[PDB]
Write a protein that holds these residues in place. Structure first.
Motif, PDB file in Angstrom:
ATOM      1  N   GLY A 146      69.019   4.953 144.634  1.00 32.55           N
ATOM      2  CA  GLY A 146      68.479   4.992 143.285  1.00 32.55           C
ATOM      3  C   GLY A 146      68.307   3.665 142.571  1.00 32.55           C
ATOM      4  O   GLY A 146      67.476   2.842 142.969  1.00 32.55           O
ATOM      5  N   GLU A 147      69.071   3.453 141.503  1.00 26.37           N
ATOM      6  CA  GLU A 147      68.881   2.279 140.656  1.00 26.37           C
ATOM      7  C   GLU A 147      70.220   1.791 140.102  1.00 26.37           C
ATOM      8  O   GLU A 147      70.356   1.494 138.914  1.00 26.37           O
ATOM      9  CB  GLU A 147      67.892   2.585 139.530  1.00 26.37           C
ATOM     10  N   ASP A 148      71.230   1.699 140.972  1.00 29.04           N
ATOM     11  CA  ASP A 148      72.533   1.132 140.629  1.00 29.04           C
ATOM     12  C   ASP A 148      73.232   1.901 139.512  1.00 29.04           C
ATOM     13  O   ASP A 148      74.281   2.509 139.740  1.00 29.04           O
ATOM     14  CB  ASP A 148      72.400  -0.343 140.236  1.00 29.04           C
ATOM     15  N   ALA A 149      72.674   1.863 138.296  1.00 28.21           N
ATOM     16  CA  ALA A 149      73.252   2.593 137.171  1.00 28.21           C
ATOM     17  C   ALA A 149      73.209   4.099 137.370  1.00 28.21           C
ATOM     18  O   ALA A 149      73.882   4.824 136.627  1.00 28.21           O
ATOM     19  CB  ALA A 149      72.530   2.231 135.871  1.00 28.21           C
ATOM     20  N   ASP A 150      72.431   4.577 138.335  1.00 25.88           N
ATOM     21  CA  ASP A 150      72.417   5.980 138.714  1.00 25.88           C
ATOM     22  C   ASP A 150      73.453   6.313 139.784  1.00 25.88           C
ATOM     23  O   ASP A 150      73.625   7.496 140.101  1.00 25.88           O
ATOM     24  CB  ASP A 150      71.025   6.373 139.227  1.00 25.88           C
ATOM     25  N   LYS A 151      74.141   5.307 140.340  1.00 29.00           N
ATOM     26  CA  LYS A 151      75.003   5.532 141.502  1.00 29.00           C
ATOM     27  C   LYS A 151      76.172   6.435 141.128  1.00 29.00           C
ATOM     28  O   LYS A 151      76.803   6.223 140.083  1.00 29.00           O
ATOM     29  CB  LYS A 151      75.532   4.213 142.073  1.00 29.00           C
ATOM     30  N   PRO A 152      76.496   7.441 141.940  1.00 21.77           N
ATOM     31  CA  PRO A 152      77.592   8.348 141.588  1.00 21.77           C
ATOM     32  C   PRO A 152      78.948   7.689 141.794  1.00 21.77           C
ATOM     33  O   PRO A 152      79.229   7.126 142.856  1.00 21.77           O
ATOM     34  CB  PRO A 152      77.391   9.533 142.537  1.00 21.77           C
ATOM     35  N   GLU A 187      64.165  12.644 151.751  1.00 19.49           N
ATOM     36  CA  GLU A 187      64.180  11.871 150.521  1.00 19.49           C
ATOM     37  C   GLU A 187      63.806  12.773 149.352  1.00 19.49           C
ATOM     38  O   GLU A 187      62.770  13.450 149.383  1.00 19.49           O
ATOM     39  CB  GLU A 187      63.242  10.666 150.628  1.00 19.49           C
ATOM     40  N   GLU A 188      64.675  12.804 148.342  1.00 19.35           N
ATOM     41  CA  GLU A 188      64.509  13.658 147.169  1.00 19.35           C
ATOM     42  C   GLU A 188      64.937  12.841 145.955  1.00 19.35           C
ATOM     43  O   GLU A 188      66.131  12.752 145.647  1.00 19.35           O
ATOM     44  CB  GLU A 188      65.329  14.932 147.287  1.00 19.35           C
ATOM     45  N   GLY A 189      63.961  12.256 145.269  1.00 18.11           N
ATOM     46  CA  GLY A 189      64.257  11.392 144.151  1.00 18.11           C
ATOM     47  C   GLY A 189      65.177  10.258 144.541  1.00 18.11           C
ATOM     48  O   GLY A 189      64.798   9.368 145.313  1.00 18.11           O
ATOM     49  N   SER A 190      66.404  10.289 144.030  1.00 17.18           N
ATOM     50  CA  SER A 190      67.331   9.184 144.199  1.00 17.18           C
ATOM     51  C   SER A 190      68.258   9.369 145.397  1.00 17.18           C
ATOM     52  O   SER A 190      69.332   8.754 145.443  1.00 17.18           O
ATOM     53  CB  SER A 190      68.147   8.995 142.919  1.00 17.18           C
ATOM     54  N   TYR A 191      67.861  10.182 146.375  1.00 13.09           N
ATOM     55  CA  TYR A 191      68.781  10.555 147.436  1.00 13.09           C
ATOM     56  C   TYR A 191      68.059  10.703 148.759  1.00 13.09           C
ATOM     57  O   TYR A 191      66.909  11.138 148.807  1.00 13.09           O
ATOM     58  CB  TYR A 191      69.500  11.853 147.091  1.00 13.09           C
ATOM     59  N   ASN A 192      68.755  10.324 149.824  1.00 16.84           N
ATOM     60  CA  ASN A 192      68.355  10.582 151.196  1.00 16.84           C
ATOM     61  C   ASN A 192      69.468  11.367 151.868  1.00 16.84           C
ATOM     62  O   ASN A 192      70.648  11.026 151.718  1.00 16.84           O
ATOM     63  CB  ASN A 192      68.114   9.280 151.957  1.00 16.84           C
TER      64      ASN A 192
END
Length: 202
Positions: A146-152, A187-192
């Motif tokens: 994703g974009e770092d700030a989205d990381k779980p 791949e689904e948005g911010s995830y593989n």
């Protein structure tokens, strides 16, 4: 355990977060469909079981429960091992439910059980990985892109031991679950993520 026991789980690479407090920081649309197809697919005249913790049961909306076409088993520490009129099993431990199924020759409403899936998150994933009756792991390996700030910030980790499991070839996954499975990464948005199967030891 005449039925095969599977533990089906989505882990996050390479750390393996099972949940972030308890929500799952992803809605993977095609994962949900994989889960439905896998747990429902049984031989003609056979049926599968789905085994989960109280908290996973409450997360399913009234709409979709009991999970249709499956023996639904709910585990909670102080359940009284009761079966309600809809056929849902309210049991206190996995061993308790295996005992009761074994006394009926692994049959549910006179149908042979085919595969038992532990789906139960949190709690019982880590309580049950250690059980040797478990024949395989069905692991959705997840990658964050994703974009770092989205990381779980994952909170709970699959108490897996790399030494105990070997990954199986895709053909064996498809044979076992009885359906063609998209192979490679998804791949689904911010995830593989990719679907994998592991069995034990030698």
């Amino acid at each position: 355990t005449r039925p095969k026991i599977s533990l089906i789980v989505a882990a996050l690479q390479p750390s393996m977060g099972i949940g972030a407090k308890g929500s799952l920081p992803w809605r993977l649309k095609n994962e949900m469909k994989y889960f439905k197809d896998v747990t429902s697919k049984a031989k003609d005249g056979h049926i599968n079981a789905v085994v989960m913790g109280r908290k996973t049961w409450e997360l399913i909306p009234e709409r979709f429960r009991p999970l249709a076409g499956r023996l639904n088993v709910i585990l909670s520490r102080k359940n009284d091992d009761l079966i309600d009129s809809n056929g849902v099993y309210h049991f206190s431990s996995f061993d308790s439910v295996m005992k009761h199924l074994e006394k009926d020759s692994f049959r549910f409403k006179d149908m042979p059980l085919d595969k038992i899936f532990i789906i139960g998150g949190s709690q019982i994933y880590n309580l049950l990985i250690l059980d040797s009756r478990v024949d395989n792991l069905l692991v959705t390996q997840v990658h964050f892109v994703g974009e770092d700030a989205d990381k779980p910030q994952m909170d709970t980790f699959l108490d897996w031991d790399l030494s105990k499991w070997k990954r199986l070839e895709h053909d064996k996954l498809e044979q076992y679950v009885g359906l063609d499975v998209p192979r490679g990464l998804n791949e689904e948005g911010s995830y593989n993520y990719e679907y994998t199967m592991w069995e034990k030891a030698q």
